[PDB]
Enzyme design. Structure first.
Site, mmCIF file in Angstrom:
data_model
loop_
_atom_site.group_PDB
_atom_site.id
_atom_site.type_symbol
_atom_site.label_atom_id
_atom_site.label_comp_id
_atom_site.label_asym_id
_atom_site.label_seq_id
_atom_site.Cartn_x
_atom_site.Cartn_y
_atom_site.Cartn_z
ATOM 1 N N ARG A 38 34.974 14.273 36.055
ATOM 2 C CA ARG A 38 35.051 13.319 34.955
ATOM 3 C C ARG A 38 34.719 13.995 33.635
ATOM 4 O O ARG A 38 35.398 13.770 32.621
ATOM 5 C CB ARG A 38 34.110 12.148 35.211
ATOM 6 C CG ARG A 38 34.315 11.005 34.222
ATOM 7 C CD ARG A 38 33.434 9.804 34.503
ATOM 8 N NE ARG A 38 33.287 8.983 33.302
ATOM 9 C CZ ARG A 38 32.118 8.596 32.806
ATOM 10 N NH1 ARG A 38 30.982 8.864 33.434
ATOM 11 N NH2 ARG A 38 32.089 7.924 31.654
ATOM 12 N N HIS A 42 37.388 14.053 30.791
ATOM 13 C CA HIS A 42 37.119 13.455 29.488
ATOM 14 C C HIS A 42 37.030 14.513 28.390
ATOM 15 O O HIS A 42 37.412 14.234 27.249
ATOM 16 C CB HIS A 42 35.856 12.590 29.560
ATOM 17 C CG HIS A 42 36.111 11.199 30.074
ATOM 18 N ND1 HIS A 42 35.277 10.130 29.804
ATOM 19 C CD2 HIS A 42 37.119 10.701 30.830
ATOM 20 C CE1 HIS A 42 35.749 9.043 30.387
ATOM 21 N NE2 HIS A 42 36.871 9.358 31.008
ATOM 22 N N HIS A 163 40.432 9.591 41.255
ATOM 23 C CA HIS A 163 39.457 8.584 41.660
ATOM 24 C C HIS A 163 39.181 8.617 43.153
ATOM 25 O O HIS A 163 38.279 7.903 43.609
ATOM 26 C CB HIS A 163 39.909 7.180 41.240
ATOM 27 C CG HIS A 163 39.875 6.968 39.757
ATOM 28 N ND1 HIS A 163 40.530 5.926 39.131
ATOM 29 C CD2 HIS A 163 39.265 7.674 38.773
ATOM 30 C CE1 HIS A 163 40.326 5.999 37.827
ATOM 31 N NE2 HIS A 163 39.562 7.053 37.582
ATOM 32 N N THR A 164 39.896 9.449 43.921
ATOM 33 C CA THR A 164 39.432 9.717 45.278
ATOM 34 C C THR A 164 38.018 10.292 45.306
ATOM 35 O O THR A 164 37.384 10.304 46.364
ATOM 36 C CB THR A 164 40.371 10.675 46.016
ATOM 37 O OG1 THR A 164 40.181 10.516 47.430
ATOM 38 C CG2 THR A 164 40.092 12.120 45.620
ATOM 39 N N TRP A 179 36.360 4.085 44.925
ATOM 40 C CA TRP A 179 37.753 3.763 45.231
ATOM 41 C C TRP A 179 38.104 4.046 46.681
ATOM 42 O O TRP A 179 39.003 3.398 47.229
ATOM 43 C CB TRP A 179 38.710 4.556 44.347
ATOM 44 C CG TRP A 179 38.657 4.217 42.905
ATOM 45 C CD1 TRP A 179 39.509 3.397 42.220
ATOM 46 C CD2 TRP A 179 37.700 4.687 41.957
ATOM 47 N NE1 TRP A 179 39.141 3.334 40.897
ATOM 48 C CE2 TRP A 179 38.034 4.120 40.709
ATOM 49 C CE3 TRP A 179 36.607 5.558 42.032
ATOM 50 C CZ2 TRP A 179 37.310 4.386 39.553
ATOM 51 C CZ3 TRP A 179 35.880 5.813 40.890
ATOM 52 C CH2 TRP A 179 36.231 5.227 39.665
ATOM 53 N N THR A 180 37.417 4.995 47.309
ATOM 54 C CA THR A 180 37.680 5.427 48.676
ATOM 55 C C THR A 180 36.365 5.428 49.442
ATOM 56 O O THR A 180 35.293 5.299 48.849
ATOM 57 C CB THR A 180 38.321 6.840 48.710
ATOM 58 O OG1 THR A 180 37.343 7.833 48.372
ATOM 59 C CG2 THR A 180 39.498 6.931 47.734
ATOM 60 N N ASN A 182 35.225 7.996 51.063
ATOM 61 C CA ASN A 182 34.806 9.392 51.166
ATOM 62 C C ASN A 182 34.826 9.955 49.760
ATOM 63 O O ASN A 182 35.704 10.742 49.397
ATOM 64 C CB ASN A 182 35.744 10.152 52.101
ATOM 65 C CG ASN A 182 37.207 9.741 51.895
ATOM 66 O OD1 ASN A 182 37.489 8.571 51.606
ATOM 67 N ND2 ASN A 182 38.125 10.686 52.015
ATOM 68 N N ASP A 187 41.242 13.977 48.732
ATOM 69 C CA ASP A 187 42.385 13.717 49.592
ATOM 70 C C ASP A 187 43.246 12.668 48.892
ATOM 71 O O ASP A 187 42.977 12.284 47.747
ATOM 72 C CB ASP A 187 41.920 13.304 50.993
ATOM 73 C CG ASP A 187 41.365 11.869 51.031
ATOM 74 O OD1 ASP A 187 41.266 11.239 49.950
ATOM 75 O OD2 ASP A 187 41.008 11.375 52.131
ATOM 76 N N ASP A 208 44.361 1.227 37.605
ATOM 77 C CA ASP A 208 44.898 1.611 38.905
ATOM 78 C C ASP A 208 46.048 0.687 39.319
ATOM 79 O O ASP A 208 47.094 1.165 39.782
ATOM 80 C CB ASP A 208 43.789 1.598 39.965
ATOM 81 C CG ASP A 208 42.548 2.397 39.560
ATOM 82 O OD1 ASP A 208 42.674 3.562 39.107
ATOM 83 O OD2 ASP A 208 41.425 1.877 39.742
HETATM 84 C C1 HEM Z 1 44.137 5.442 33.735
HETATM 85 C C2 HEM Z 1 43.296 6.458 33.658
HETATM 86 C C3 HEM Z 1 41.775 6.310 33.919
HETATM 87 C C4 HEM Z 1 40.935 5.285 33.763
HETATM 88 C C5 HEM Z 1 41.272 3.895 33.172
HETATM 89 C C6 HEM Z 1 39.626 5.720 34.230
HETATM 90 C C7 HEM Z 1 38.455 4.996 34.231
HETATM 91 C C8 HEM Z 1 37.288 5.311 34.896
HETATM 92 C C9 HEM Z 1 36.073 4.523 34.921
HETATM 93 C C10 HEM Z 1 35.862 3.169 34.200
HETATM 94 C C11 HEM Z 1 35.180 5.159 35.681
HETATM 95 C C12 HEM Z 1 33.743 4.701 35.995
HETATM 96 C C13 HEM Z 1 32.709 5.733 35.556
HETATM 97 C C14 HEM Z 1 31.357 5.204 35.964
HETATM 98 O O1 HEM Z 1 31.071 3.996 35.713
HETATM 99 O O2 HEM Z 1 30.583 5.984 36.584
HETATM 100 C C15 HEM Z 1 35.795 6.374 36.158
HETATM 101 C C16 HEM Z 1 35.211 7.319 36.952
HETATM 102 C C17 HEM Z 1 35.798 8.491 37.351
HETATM 103 N N1 HEM Z 1 36.996 8.973 36.879
HETATM 104 FE FE1 HEM Z 1 38.494 7.864 36.032
HETATM 105 N N2 HEM Z 1 39.725 7.019 34.674
HETATM 106 C C18 HEM Z 1 41.035 7.393 34.504
HETATM 107 C C19 HEM Z 1 41.594 8.612 34.804
HETATM 108 C C20 HEM Z 1 40.964 9.617 35.479
HETATM 109 C C21 HEM Z 1 41.451 10.973 35.655
HETATM 110 C C22 HEM Z 1 42.786 11.460 35.065
HETATM 111 C C23 HEM Z 1 40.524 11.640 36.353
HETATM 112 C C24 HEM Z 1 40.516 13.097 36.865
HETATM 113 C C25 HEM Z 1 41.646 13.725 37.208
HETATM 114 C C26 HEM Z 1 39.466 10.692 36.660
HETATM 115 C C27 HEM Z 1 38.332 10.958 37.374
HETATM 116 C C28 HEM Z 1 37.235 10.150 37.525
HETATM 117 C C29 HEM Z 1 36.144 10.410 38.426
HETATM 118 C C30 HEM Z 1 35.995 11.620 39.366
HETATM 119 C C31 HEM Z 1 35.270 9.426 38.324
HETATM 120 C C32 HEM Z 1 33.962 9.330 39.159
HETATM 121 C C33 HEM Z 1 32.744 9.746 38.345
HETATM 122 C C34 HEM Z 1 31.543 9.630 39.239
HETATM 123 O O3 HEM Z 1 31.719 9.320 40.455
HETATM 124 O O4 HEM Z 1 30.430 9.843 38.703
HETATM 125 N N3 HEM Z 1 39.761 9.481 36.098
HETATM 126 N N4 HEM Z 1 37.073 6.425 35.661
HETATM 127 NA NA NA Z 2 37.967 10.475 48.753
#
Ligand code: HEM
Ligand code: NA
Ligand SMILES: O=C1O[C@H]([C@@H](O)CO)C(O)=C1O
Length: 250
Positions: A38, A42, A163-164, A179-180, A182, A187, A208
């Site tokens: 993330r 970001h 988000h996997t 989201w998953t 695991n 994956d 999503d």
């Molecule tokens: C439509 C595009 C996206 C939206 C609207 C979005 C939104 C969000 C939101 C709201 C969270 C919650 C963060 C939290 O409360 O801890 C999140 C987490 C996360 N996002 Fe997305 N995101 C997007 C695209 C992406 C992309 C492109 C990636 C990486 C390739 C990504 C990877 C992650 C990951 C790994 C988390 C987990 C963070 C954690 O578990 O601490 N996201 N995202």
């Molecule tokens: Na996963």
């Protein structure tokens, strides 16, 4: 679209390889791969192709960017990574954070995102409000990823697969849960849960859901759910482009 990558010094290259190794140990130990991705996403996702501003250029170091609402909680990742910058100070924050994203994906069993070093730390954090809005729809995705970042529809769907890993945190974005099942395994499960419909104990954002509602996005999600290999290839490709937005353009 084309790249002309700098050849960094042998010292720089060595710092990169030593950083990657420390990153692997850290990320696996602390189970923070999702947050690291993330951070990298970001850091990179603020790029705007018309103005040539934003992008993966270390600005998330600045507490100002860490204060953007989209970036709630990344200050933890920035603090977490600082001992790696301290051991290898030659590295730029911009490289360090992108490398951490690449390592995050690798340690959770995901594909090998190539990495080309040489990003310079820019002084000016971009203006807040370019990263996607989780409540908006398919046309907002194309605004942020396409018109701003300059990535393709295929990129949008593949990158969403990130988000996997991980989960929402009420204190950060106001959403809650993974989201998953695991969240430390890279994956194609994200697409399968999406295509499965809402269920108890798993999060789906409207951003999503916009993938199942568009004629281009939905076949791609179907394809990624059926064929993890094709997901890995397209994700590798898009993550590479995302990590080098605005960097080393030819
Ligand atoms: C439509 C595009 C996206 C939206 C609207 C979005 C939104 C969000 C939101 C709201 C969270 C919650 C963060 C939290 O409360 O801890 C999140 C987490 C996360 N996002 Fe997305 N995101 C997007 C695209 C992406 C992309 C492109 C990636 C990486 C390739 C990504 C990877 C992650 C990951 C790994 C988390 C987990 C963070 C954690 O578990 O601490 N996201 N995202
Ligand atoms: Na996963
Ligand atoms: O991905 C993450 O790793 C850390 C924590 O879970 C383990 O250090 C953080 O709070 C997450 O969102």
């Amino acid at each position: 679209m084309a790249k002309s990558y700098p050849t960094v010094s042998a010292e720089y290259q060595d710092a990169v390889e030593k950083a990657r190794r420390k990153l692997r140990a850290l990320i696996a130990e602390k189970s923070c791969a999702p947050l690291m991705l993330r951070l990298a996403w970001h850091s990179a996702g603020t790029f705007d192709v018309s103005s040539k501003t934003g992008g993966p250029f270390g600005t998330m170091k600045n507490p100002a960017e860490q204060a953007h609402g989209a970036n709630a909680g990344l200050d933890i990742a920035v603090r977490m990574l600082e001992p790696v910058k301290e051991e290898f100070p030659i590295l730029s924050y911009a490289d360090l954070y992108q490398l951490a994203g690449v390592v995050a994906v690798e340690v959770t069993g995901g594909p090998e995102v190539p990495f080309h070093p040489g990003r310079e730390d820019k002084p000016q954090p971009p203006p807040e409000g370019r990263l996607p809005d989780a409540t908006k729809g398919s046309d907002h995705l194309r605004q942020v990823f396409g018109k701003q970042m300059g990535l393709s529809d295929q990129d949008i769907v593949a990158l969403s697969g990130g988000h996997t890993l991980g989960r929402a945190h009420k204190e950060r974005s106001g959403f809650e849960g993974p989201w998953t099942r695991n969240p430390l395994v890279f994956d194609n499960s994200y697409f399968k849960e999406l295509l499965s419909g809402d269920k108890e104990g798993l999060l789906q954002l409207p951003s999503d859901k916009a993938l199942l509602s568009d004629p281009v996005f939905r076949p791609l999600a179907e394809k990624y759910a059926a064929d993890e290999d094709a997901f890995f290839d397209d994700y590798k490709e898009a993550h590479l482009k995302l990590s080098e937005l605005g960097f080393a353009d030819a």
